[PDB]
């Protein structure tokens, strides 16, 4: 139990190190409680352009998002390495866990940056409106909506970084990823992680009953989003011609249901 508490603390601490923008910080900015200036608002084309602190509209946003999606994968890999037992695993299984886990964690943590009307960008320096991202052509104006939809559902659980540190370790340590060689040692780690999450939720949220259950239910909603996001990529395969995909994102998306 002191084991369970110390594992919560350690996860929390590396979470702080790995991820430059926490939910606390995002929340303080989003609710106007900050002091730390106020983000530049992007609600259209001209505001996108003045928001400066190469090609076509929706493509520009697409490519931008790619630099930060790469960076997010780097951050999450850093963080995964900190999960006790992770770097003790077979090297191919480590890759698999990341390969399949990273999207689910991006979506989860992207909620932290969202309200129903928009999203923080440039680590809190910017605010891009939901309606604007929706105004992009083709398959591009349909990428964010199911994220906002999920963020509204997920944010009502009212988790803080302490909770989230553990939840994302749980997601990474999923023994049910395809092509995994040694399932057992992954599931023994996750078992342990679920016990720390369960105790963490009880103590930090003593009045919000069955939160544990409800959080775990969100794992079906995360995986539908992943499913959807990939089908939208497959539309950018044919519909769009010259569209540089980043090598890291390529190997992430190569052979993934």
């Amino acid at each position: 139990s002191a084991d369970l508490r110390a594992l919560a603390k350690h996860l929390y601490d590396s979470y702080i190190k790995s991820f430059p923008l926490t939910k606390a910080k995002a929340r303080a900015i989003l609710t106007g409680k900050t002091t730390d200036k106020s983000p530049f608002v992007i609600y259209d084309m001209n505001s996108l352009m003045m928001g400066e602190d190469s090609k076509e509209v929706a493509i520009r946003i697409f490519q931008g998002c790619q630099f930060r999606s790469v960076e997010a994968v780097q951050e999450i890999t850093e963080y995964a390495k900190s999960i006790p037992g992770f770097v003790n695993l077979d090297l191919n299984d480590q890759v698999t866990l990341l390969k399949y886990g990273v999207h689910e964690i991006i979506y989860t943590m992207l909620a932290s940056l969202m309200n129903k009307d928009g999203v923080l960008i440039s680590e809190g320096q910017g605010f891009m409106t939901r309606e604007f991202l929706k105004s992009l052509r083709k398959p591009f104006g349909d990428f964010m909506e199911p994220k906002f939809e999920f963020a509204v559902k997920f944010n009502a659980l009212e988790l803080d970084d302490s909770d989230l540190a553990i939840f994302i370790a749980v997601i990474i340590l999923s023994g049910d990823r395809p092509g995994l060689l040694n399932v057992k040692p992954i599931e023994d780690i996750q078992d342990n992680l679920l016990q720390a999450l369960e105790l963490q939720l009880k103590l930090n949220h003593p009045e919000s009953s069955q939160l544990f259950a409800k959080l775990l239910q969100k794992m079906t909603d995360l995986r539908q989003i992943v499913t959807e996001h990939v089908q939208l990529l497959q539309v950018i395969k044919k519909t769009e011609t010259d569209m540089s995909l980043h090598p890291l994102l390529q190997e992430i998306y190569k052979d993934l249901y």
Partner: peptide, 16 residues
């Protein structure tokens, strides 16, 4: 297959 960069992230850490 192979996953050059992931292997390399797991091994070298980031970037600066």
């Amino acid at each position: 297959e192979r996953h050059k960069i992931l292997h390399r992230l797991l091994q070298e850490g980031s970037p600066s």
